[PDB]
Chains A and B, each alone.
With several copies, the nearest count.
Chain A
Amino acid sequence: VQLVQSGAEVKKPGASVKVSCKASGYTFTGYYMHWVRQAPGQGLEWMGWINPISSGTSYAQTFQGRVTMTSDTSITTAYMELSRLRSDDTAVYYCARAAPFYDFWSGYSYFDYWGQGTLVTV
């Protein structure tokens, strides 16, 4: 299982950034793709997830209304687009894999695979 993210981005306040995550080594639609943010000197913050099979999403109230997640199963790639960027959105963004909510042994409760962090500067 591998998760490969795009390179670092530099954006001005008010701009939007789209961070991609290409997945391989597993059935893409068999898992939820989560995004987790880590601001400099801070811990990990969950942003939301997308379910590639339907492209259904869920977002943290913190980002809801600013972040849109999409995916394309034909290239097994997930995307996270964060709009209206502010200076306090400077952070390393990770994609992470977790089981779907129907997993009997609660594999959805945690993230078992992570991509390399993508730094976004605002």
Chain B
Amino acid sequence: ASVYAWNRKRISNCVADYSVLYNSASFSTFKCYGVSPTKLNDLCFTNVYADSFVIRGDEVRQIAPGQTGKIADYNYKLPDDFTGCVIAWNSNNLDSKVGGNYNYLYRLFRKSNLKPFERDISTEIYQAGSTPCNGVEGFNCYFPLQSYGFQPTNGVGYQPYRVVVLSFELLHAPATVCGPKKSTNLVKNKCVNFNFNGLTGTGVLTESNKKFLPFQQFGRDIADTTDAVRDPQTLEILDITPCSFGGV
């Protein structure tokens, strides 16, 4: 997709192996925010969004938290608290042609900056002056979009880059996108380390007598800390207590 009209792919209910992408030699940029690129396979998310678009080399830096510029402000905005990975590679051999590839557009003018993950695909004439344009471009009335005109002979900063942004959603909800980690047998009545669908900690797992509702995945005590979980494979409710401790 063009950066002004970027394409969002929703990913859910699957196993996400991020090492295939991260350990690839084929990407020039692989920057993760809010998460380590080498811990991704240990995590579970409630959703992953893969946003794909084409920009020119020099603009790749704008696809990040806290950035400004024509792309960051008018085309594709990432939130300051963004969690996810920005992956980009040179696509000069695909998205460039002799005479110029004018199928890739970006927004050059807008009344205001975009909100995070806002997608503005309008083509209304931009009013630069104080006089209404009435849909007709001319002096102080601009067509809001412009082409990159990608050519195979351009310098790197003007070559096309294909960018995929993987945003990681972390809601208080059942996680549906987990890395390729092998599960172990469930152990009860012992002090163990545990990881229940991304929920980690240390304690003793016992059979729970708490009547969870069909939609509830875990419970909390008056301290607002997890004290019970629903086993993601058996749907058994387990109570979590801390391992014996005290002063000596």
Contact = CB atoms under 8 A, between A and B. Distances in A.
B245 interface: no
A13 to B, nearest CB: 32
Given A28-B149, A29-B147, A102 B102 contact: no
A75 B99 contact: yes
Contact of A27 (B109, B140, B149): B149
B58 interface: no
B149 A30 contact: yes
A73 interface: yes
B11 interface: no
A100 B149 contact: no
B207 interface: no
B103 to A, nearest CB: 8
Contact of B128 (A28, A51, A76, A102): A102
Contacts of B219: none
A87 interface: no
Interface string A52-76: 0110101000000000000001111
A28 B137 contact: no
Interface in B76-124: 99-100, 102, 108-109, 123
B34 interface: no
B142 interface: yes
B137 A29 contact: no
A54 B140 contact: no
Contacts of A27: 100, 147-149
Contacts of B145: 53-54
Contact of B149 (A29, A56, A58, A75): A29
Contacts of A53: 143, 145-147
Chain A interface mostly: mixed
Given A28-B100, A101-B138, A56 B143 contact: yes
B141 interface: yes
A119 to B, nearest CB: 27
Interface string B143-176: 1011111000000000000000000000000000
Nearest to B123: A54
Contact of A102 (B100, B109, B123, B147): B109
Nearest to B148: A27
Interface string A63-101: 000000000011110000000000000000000000011
Contact of B143 (A28, A51, A74, A76): A51
Nearest to B109: A102
B147 A73 contact: yes
B139 interface: yes
Interface in A11-63: 24, 27-30, 51, 53-54, 56, 58
Contacts of A29: 102, 146-147, 149
Contacts of A73: 102, 147
B99 A58 contact: no
B108 to A, nearest CB: 8
B142 A102 contact: yes
A105 to B, nearest CB: 15
Contacts of B139: 101
Interface in B38-57: none
A54 B100 contact: no
7 contacts: A27-B148, A29-B146, A51-B137, A51-B143, A73-B102, A100-B142, A102-B108
Interface of B: 99-100, 102, 108-109, 123, 128, 136-143, 145-149
